[PDB]
Structure formats: C-alpha cells, structure tokens
Paper text:
Within this class of proteins, the bromodomain and extraterminal domain (BET) family contains four members that are transcriptional coregulators and that recognize acetyllysines (AcKs) using a tandem pair of highly homologous bromodomains (BDs). Despite heavy academic and industry investment in this area, the generation of paralog-selective inhibitors has proved elusive because of the extremely high sequence similarity between the bromodomains of family members (90 to 95% within the acetyllysine-binding pocket residues). Using the highly conserved BET BDs as a model system, we conducted three mRNA display-based RaPID (random nonstandard peptides integrated discovery) screens using a single library (which contains >1012 unique members). Crystal structures of 13 distinct peptide–bromodomain complexes revealed highly diverse structures and binding modes among the cyclic peptide ligands.
Numbering used by the authors:
A (entry chain A): 39 to 166
B (entry chain E): 1 to 14
C (entry chain C): 61 to 165
The structure:
C-alpha cells in the first residue's frame, strides 16, 4: 500500500521543437488565454489536475495526455509553438480530457463548457 | 461515477 | 507490404492508444445495454476484427482494410451524438489513424 502520486507535468520547452512567435500566438497569449485565465471558472484548469488532492486514483489511469492552462501559459511565454493551430490543439485536449473523464452536467464540465464557449469567441477573432 | 463501455471510475463530482 | 504496415505499425499504434479500449472488440450490445445499436449500425466493425482479418489474409488490398477502419469510426459518429465522450475518444483515435496511414509505403 501507499500514497498515490501525480505524474510529472507536461513539458513547457523542447530544444528539438522549432520555436516561433507569430501575431496569432501573441493574440492567443495576451487576449485568448488572458480572458480565460481571469474567468471565475478558471481555477480548476490553471494547473495540472491534482489527482492526489482530488482523491482521483483513476484520473491518470484514464487520461494519458493531460493538459492545463498553466502548461499552455508557459508554452506560449517560451515560444513553444510554431503556429496557432498547435496551441489551439492544447486547448482542445484540455477540454476533451475533462469531457471524457467527467459526466455531462458535472460542475467541472459546466465550467469547462463555459470556458470553451469563451475560447471559441476569442479565436473567432484571431487576427491575420 | 462515470461508466464508458464496461469501464467505471470516480469523477470530480464524487 | 502495405497490409503488413497496417497490421504491424498502424493497428499496433492504435491498439496501445489511451482511448482504444472501446474499439478493441465487437460491440456486445446486450452486455453493454445498448438495445438499439444493431438496429442503427448495419455494419459493425472493430480493431479486434480488423486484426483477425489482417492476420488471416482477408483483405484484397490495403484500401479495403482502411475502409473497415473508417467504418469503425463512422459507426461511432452515427450512434452517438457529436461531443459525446465516446465520440471524442473515437476522434482522437482517428486523428492518430490518419497520421499513421499518411506515411504508408
């Protein structure tokens, strides 16, 4: 027996992955992520899922590619992405993970759906 | 609790 | 050559995916309590059946095997509504599938 543990967080930099900072990626950090980060429902998503504190031994048994806004935040500040599509995929992974692991109607799903609808509003104005 | 195709786990709701 | 790649690489990669477990065997609609499944899904398909077909010289060519893969994905998108958890799992599996077959020899 023992205490269940959290896996290491996802990487926020990589010397082998090409770096870039386009105006869309700037917009994703200073507008899109900025709006979601300050939302009232943002707190469960600003850091990797803490399965230990949440007493969720099955979470990382189900989710093998976790994602959070704190990882996304560091990736944007580090110019981790080459384009906006790569960053948008990290957002969708975060949402999809929450929708697969939790039931429709759950509080965490209601909060994730609210953040996603706001996310879709901002990326609809992604600049040229 | 959530069940997907014969596999069950605790959600954040529980 | 291409049928070897689908059995040795493509299926092996998808079978080890985190969201592969609902698609590794035929849908037992009775055991899973899905009474309308085979009324709606006329041609069920799964990676376990594709494995048996790839091992037993079933497919005429690699394109027939790819059709069975797409049928498996299409079935999920037909039976479950968009945005369902199982649908998202199928889309993740499908995206990896399209990436692995795009490098077909």
């Amino acid at each position: 027996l023992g205490s269940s543990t959290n896996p290491p967080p996802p990487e926020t930099s990589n010397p082998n992955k090409p770096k870039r900072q386009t105006n869309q990626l700037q917009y994703l950090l200073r507008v899109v992520l900025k709006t979601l980060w300050k939302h009232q429902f943002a707190w469960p998503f600003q850091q990797p899922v803490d399965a230990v504190k949440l007493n969720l031994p099955d979470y990382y048994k189900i989710i093998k590619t976790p994602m959070d806004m704190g990882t996304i935040k560091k990736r944007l500040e580090n110019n981790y992405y080459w384009n906006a599509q790569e960053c948008i995929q990290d957002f969708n992974t975060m949402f999809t993970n929450c929708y697969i692991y939790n039931k429709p109607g759950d509080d965490i799903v209601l909060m994730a759906e609210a953040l996603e609808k706001l996310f879709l509003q901002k990326i609809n104005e992604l600049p040229t | 609790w959530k069940t997907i195709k014969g596999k069950t786990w605790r959600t954040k709701q529980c």
